[PDB]
Amino acid sequence: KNNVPRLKLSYKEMLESNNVITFNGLANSSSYHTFLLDEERSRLYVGAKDHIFSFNLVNIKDFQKIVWPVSYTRRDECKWAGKDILKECANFIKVLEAYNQTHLYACGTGAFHPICTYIEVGHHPEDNIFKLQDSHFENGRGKSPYDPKLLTASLLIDGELYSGTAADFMGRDFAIFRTLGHHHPIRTEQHDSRWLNDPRFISAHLIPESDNPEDDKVYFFFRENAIDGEHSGKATHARIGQICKNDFGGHRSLVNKWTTFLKARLICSVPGPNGIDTHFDELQDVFLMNSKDPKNPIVYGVFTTSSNIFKGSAVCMYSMSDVRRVFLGPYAHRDGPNYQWVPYQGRVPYPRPGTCPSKTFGGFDSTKDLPDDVITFARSHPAMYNPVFPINNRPIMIKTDVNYQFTQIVVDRVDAEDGQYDVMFIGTDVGTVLKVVSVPKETWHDLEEVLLEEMTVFREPTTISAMELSTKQQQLYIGSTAGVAQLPLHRCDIY
Amino acid sequence: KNNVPRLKLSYKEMLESNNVITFNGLANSSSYHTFLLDEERSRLYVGAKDHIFSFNLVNIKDFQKIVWPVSYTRRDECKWAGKDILKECANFIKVLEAYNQTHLYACGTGAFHPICTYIEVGHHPEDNIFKLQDSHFENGRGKSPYDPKLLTASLLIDGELYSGTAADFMGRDFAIFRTLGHHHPIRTEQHDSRWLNDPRFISAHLIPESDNPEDDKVYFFFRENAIDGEHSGKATHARIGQICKNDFGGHRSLVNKWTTFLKARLICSVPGPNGIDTHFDELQDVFLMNSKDPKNPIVYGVFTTSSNIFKGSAVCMYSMSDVRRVFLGPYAHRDGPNYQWVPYQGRVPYPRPGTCPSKTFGGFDSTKDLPDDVITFARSHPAMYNPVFPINNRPIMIKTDVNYQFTQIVVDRVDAEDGQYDVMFIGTDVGTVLKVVSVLLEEMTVFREPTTISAMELSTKQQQLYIGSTAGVAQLPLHRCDIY
Numbered sequence: 001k002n003n004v005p006r007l008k009l010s011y012k013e014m015l016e017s018n019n020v021i022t023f024n025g026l027a028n029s030s031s032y033h034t035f036l037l038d039e040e041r042s043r044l045y046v047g048a049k050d051h052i053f054s055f056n057l058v059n060i061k062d063f064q065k066i067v068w069p070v071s072y073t074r075r076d077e078c079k080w081a082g083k084d085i086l087k088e089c090a091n092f093i094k095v096l097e098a099y100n101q102t103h104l105y106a107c108g109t110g111a112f113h114p115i116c117t118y119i120e121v122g123h124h125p126e127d128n129i130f131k132l133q134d135s136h137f138e139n140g141r142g143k144s145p146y147d148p149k150l151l152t153a154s155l156l157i158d159g160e161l162y163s164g165t166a167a168d169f170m171g172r173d174f175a176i177f178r179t180l181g182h183h184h185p186i187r188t189e190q191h192d193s194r195w196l197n198d199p200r201f202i203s204a205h206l207i208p209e210s211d212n213p214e215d216d217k218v219y220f221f222f223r224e225n226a227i228d229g230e231h232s233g234k235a236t237h238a239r240i241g242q243i244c245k246n247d248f249g250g251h252r253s254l255v256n257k258w259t260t261f262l263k264a265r266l267i268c269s270v271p272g273p274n275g276i277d278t279h280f281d282e283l284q285d286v287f288l289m290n291s292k293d294p295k296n297p298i299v300y301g302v303f304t305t306s307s308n309i310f311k312g313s314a315v316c317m318y319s320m321s322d323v324r325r326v327f328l329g330p331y332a333h334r335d336g337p338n339y340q341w342v343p344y345q346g347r348v349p350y351p352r353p354g355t356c357p358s359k360t361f362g363g364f365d366s367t368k369d370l371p372d373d374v375i376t377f378a379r380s381h382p383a384m385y386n387p388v389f390p391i392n393n394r395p396i397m398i399k400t401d402v403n404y405q406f407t408q409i410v411v412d413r414v415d416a417e418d419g420q421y422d423v424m425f426i427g428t429d430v431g432t433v434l435k436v437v438s439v440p441k442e443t444w445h446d447l448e449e450v451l452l453e454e455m456t457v458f459r460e461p462t463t464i465s466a467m468e469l470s471t472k473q474q475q476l477y478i479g480s481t482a483g484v485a486q487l488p489l490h491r492c493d494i495y
Numbered sequence: 496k497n498n499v500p501r502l503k504l505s506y507k508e509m510l511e512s513n514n515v516i517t518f519n520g521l522a523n524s525s526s527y528h529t530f531l532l533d534e535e536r537s538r539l540y541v542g543a544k545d546h547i548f549s550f551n552l553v554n555i556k557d558f559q560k561i562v563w564p565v566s567y568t569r570r571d572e573c574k575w576a577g578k579d580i581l582k583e584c585a586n587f588i589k590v591l592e593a594y595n596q597t598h599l600y601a602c603g604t605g606a607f608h609p610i611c612t613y614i615e616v617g618h619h620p621e622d623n624i625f626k627l628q629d630s631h632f633e634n635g636r637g638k639s640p641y642d643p644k645l646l647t648a649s650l651l652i653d654g655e656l657y658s659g660t661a662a663d664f665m666g667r668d669f670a671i672f673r674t675l676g677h678h679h680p681i682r683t684e685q686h687d688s689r690w691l692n693d694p695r696f697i698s699a700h701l702i703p704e705s706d707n708p709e710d711d712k713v714y715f716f717f718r719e720n721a722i723d724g725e726h727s728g729k730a731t732h733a734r735i736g737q738i739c740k741n742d743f744g745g746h747r748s749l750v751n752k753w754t755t756f757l758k759a760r761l762i763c764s765v766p767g768p769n770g771i772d773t774h775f776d777e778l779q780d781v782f783l784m785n786s787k788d789p790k791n792p793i794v795y796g797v798f799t800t801s802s803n804i805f806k807g808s809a810v811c812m813y814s815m816s817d818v819r820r821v822f823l824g825p826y827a828h829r830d831g832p833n834y835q836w837v838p839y840q841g842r843v844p845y846p847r848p849g850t851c852p853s854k855t856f857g858g859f860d861s862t863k864d865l866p867d868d869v870i871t872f873a874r875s876h877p878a879m880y881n882p883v884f885p886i887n888n889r890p891i892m893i894k895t896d897v898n899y900q901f902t903q904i905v906v907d908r909v910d911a912e913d914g915q916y917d918v919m920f921i922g923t924d925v926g927t928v929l930k931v932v933s934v935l936l937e938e939m940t941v942f943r944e945p946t947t948i949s950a951m952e953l954s955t956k957q958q959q960l961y962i963g964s965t966a967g968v969a970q971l972p973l974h975r976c977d978i979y
């Protein structure tokens with residue numbers, strides 16, 4: 001029933017108890033935001049400014065660094081663009097995923113000229129190979145943004161890259177891309193408000209729908225500016241967008257453009273007395289709690305208030321069964337520009353747009369062999385009407401009166417000799433980490449919030465940008481421009 | 496540039512300094528919310544549960560009362576109706592207003608059967624009369640709600656009663672009525688969310704426009720549920736409405752109904768960085784500062800956040816020049832329920848809807864003589880498209896860190912050595928009054944126990960402030976510079 005940490009600690013105390021291994025980062029670098037955890041290779045990769053690191057996730061003081069800056073020529077070109085020589089004209093690594101069984105794929109802002117390449121790690125982890133394959137350099141457009149201020153939700157599977165970010169120099173052509181591989185890169189309609197409206201990506205996950213890979217979907221989480229009318233009402237909408245991994249675009253229309261793209265509002269609010277709810281629209285981070293059933297990973301989300309005078313944070317939970325229901329629900333439909341959004345009620349193209357091409361029903365092989373009505377629809381119906389509410393219609397945690405806001409989250413399923421509890425590790429914009437448990441107080445609905453620890457993990461206060469949980473090292477890794485930080489999950493002999 | 500009070504005295508500290516005179520109220524009464532300040536008679540009237548008091552503006556310890564509790568039969572028909580005998584089946588007065596030069600008009604919850612009567616107080620404030628003219632008894636349909644939990648905004652001028660409440664037993668028929676005074680009662684359209692949609696009234700004021708009494712309009716202030724498509728997103732819209740004092744409805748169609756009603760949204764928000772503003776739509780009280788020009792009183796308003804989690808209160812100022820600009824602008828317009836609201840680009844009938852009939856300009860000297868096209872319009876065009884923003888597009892004061900919320904307000908115009916300064920005495924839902932000057936002087940508790948301040952009057956001819964609540968009334972001096 002309290003909101004005070006039963007165990008508070010500062011970077012100081014943490015350092016005087018063996019609970020923090022700080023990497024202060026090189027003097028000629030920053031922005032250690034991109035994390036690529038690798039349990040197998042037992043290393044923790046962190047792509048930053050002009051560099052890419054390979055930390056030893058047992059003690060991040062031991063590592064390797066691939067200095068990957070940009071050519072003098074490129075630097076100058078960025079300079080001539082009237083940009084910030086130090087803050088902007090640098091190669092900020094924004095993408096870092098796995099590719100070959102011996103190479104990583106990395107992308108970054110090549111000083112407002114996105115470039116990517118490979119990072120040979122090798123076959124055997126025994127011989128820690130951290131070699132950068134220079135001279136190649138592939139087009140970074142659509143993979144890493146031009147502006148370092150923008151992030152990227154990346155997902156690299158089966159040799160193909162999925163990434164949502166701003167694709168242009170002007171940084172106003174945001175789109176979900178599918179690069180690499182065999183086929184021509186896939187993209188979302190550009191300059192189309194109904195598809196994407198000045199969004200900001202958070203993450204992308206490969207979620208299987210059944211035992212048939214043919215039915216694999218890729219979910220992107222992101223926030224964007226709402227759209228409804230020409231009335232005084234700007235607003236944010238956290239969202240989740242689904243797309244079929246086996247989508248290859250239209251035939252005589254959406255050429256090389258997703259055909260199975262749909263989105264739904266993710267609502268994270270707290271019911272009120274007079275019937276008006278309090279919403280946490282600003283989606284900051286998302287973590288998937290892998291259930292034994294890969295088809296139903298639990299979705300935790302870290303949301304924030306839109307108001308500048310009412311700072312607040314929330315942690316909402318969603319079940320895929322819900323998102324799937326929404327995605328199988330009414331399509332948001334609007335007749336004219338000055339019409340109220342209404343749930344579409346009348347003839348839906350078959351197969352249902354949004355549904356992946358199946359060699360069992362309809363028989364239609366490949367998206368490229370779909371009717372025209374199933375391409376015209378979806379093309380103007382990217383959004384679902386009904387929103388997906390959190391489990392139980394409320395967040396499992398809320399922090400208001402506090403002076404900081406949540407920025408990252410990860411959770412471990414710890415089995416206790418009296419049941420299992422989902423322990424959340426929430427990162428703050430202040431540089432502190434909170435460990436909380438939401439045990440159901442006597443009954444689901446009236447649950448108790450327990451703040452176990454509040455540990456600062458950076459000499460100076462900074463915004464936490466990345467968190468990676470290791471269930472093989474039992475170590476948490478925080479990231480920021482100030483550098484990376486490592487700490488143990490527990491500390492049971494200090495309570 | 497601060498948030499801490501220079502003078503934070505508690506009730507104990509206020510009582511131990513003659514800073515507050517307390518009336519713990521009667522045991523058989525409560526809800527002392529209906530205030531009526533009479534300078535001339537130097538008394539302060541008050542409406543309450545089965546009672547109507549009369550406090551002395553010098554010492555509320557000295558007072559007269561009137562017992563008006565509803566008969567047995569009525570108390571019984573209310574019980575069988577399935578109401579709470581203790582907190583419902585009683586006569587809670589909701590309207591106290593001066594009527595004749597010798598009488599006051601009063602109405603209360605007739606134990607869910609509102610009734611009204613007069614209250615004699617003679618010509619001379621010397622004889623201090625307070626006789627409850629019993630017998631007869633008129634009904635209070637449209638004058639007072641049936642439900643004590645509902646407020647009412649009244650204004651009785653020229654022998655006419657203007658009020659906005661629930662005209663029904665079920666408390667669902669909210670309306671703005673004008674009863675009394677020579678003509679058949681006139682009211683807003685029943686069951687039409689466009690006109691009014693589950694509103695909560697706050698107050699009505701007469702404000703002339705021109706130097707012609709015929710252009711006089713009555714303005715109501717209230718808060719109601721916004722309407723914007725079947726699509727969800729419940730929200731509150733603070734509002735202000737106007738009505739011509741001389742509106743008596745049409746010949747046929749809109750018969751005995753406002754043909755001049757128009758209403759506009761009142762915005763009180765704070766600009767944000769990402770273009771998103773923080774709004775305070777829950778109007779709580781209104782005070783008009785009589786400026787030099789009687790056609791331009793400054794409008795102060797106390798708004799609160801709709802959010803149950805984040806508590807926050809704000810005060811906002813509005814000029815009647817702005818309000819009038821909005822009423823002379825585009826009406827809101829819809830082609831149906833599935834359409835977006837849009838400023839009416841069509842051709843507005845003449846005379847312009849919302850325009851008081853006049854024996855001068857206009858050509859018409861009666862609202863009943865208006866043509867069909869205007870009456871038809873209006874009937875479906877009671878709302879305006881442009882909301883009226885507050886002076887500077889910002890609120891004067893803000894409180895969010897605070898763990899309470901404003902509930903009442905009054906302001907005094909005090910002449911000093913530097914110039915005139917407007918001091919705002921803000922009430923609180925936790926028994927407390929904040930004194931504020933602009934460009935927090937003191938935070939004083941005024942009740943032994945915490946409650947909601949629901950009434951607040953200011954007597955300049957006595958330099959005192961009176962606060963209302965269910966606990967009782969509280970007297971307090973505007974300054975007491977000694978404590979400083």
Ligand SMILES: CC(=O)N[C@@H]1[C@@H](O)[C@H](O)[C@@H](CO)O[C@H]1O
Pocket residue numbers: 026028029050067069
């Ligand atoms: C050009 C560049 O930034 N890379 C240097 C790298 O060559 C050097 O070994 C290291 C030592 O701290 O410092 C980095 O900043």
Ligand SMILES: CC(=O)N[C@@H]1[C@@H](O)[C@H](O)[C@@H](CO)O[C@H]1O
Pocket residue numbers: 099100101102103118
């Ligand atoms: C070992 C292997 O088969 N993986 C390949 C690697 O051989 C190749 O050089 C690289 C592109 O440079 O792409 C990887 O996926």
Ligand SMILES: CC(=O)N[C@@H]1[C@@H](O)[C@H](O)[C@@H](CO)O[C@H]1O
Pocket residue numbers: 521522523524545562564
């Ligand atoms: C409810 C009622 O009938 N009113 C009584 C009144 O007769 C009496 O004069 C007064 C003073 O004690 O107390 C009230 O409760």
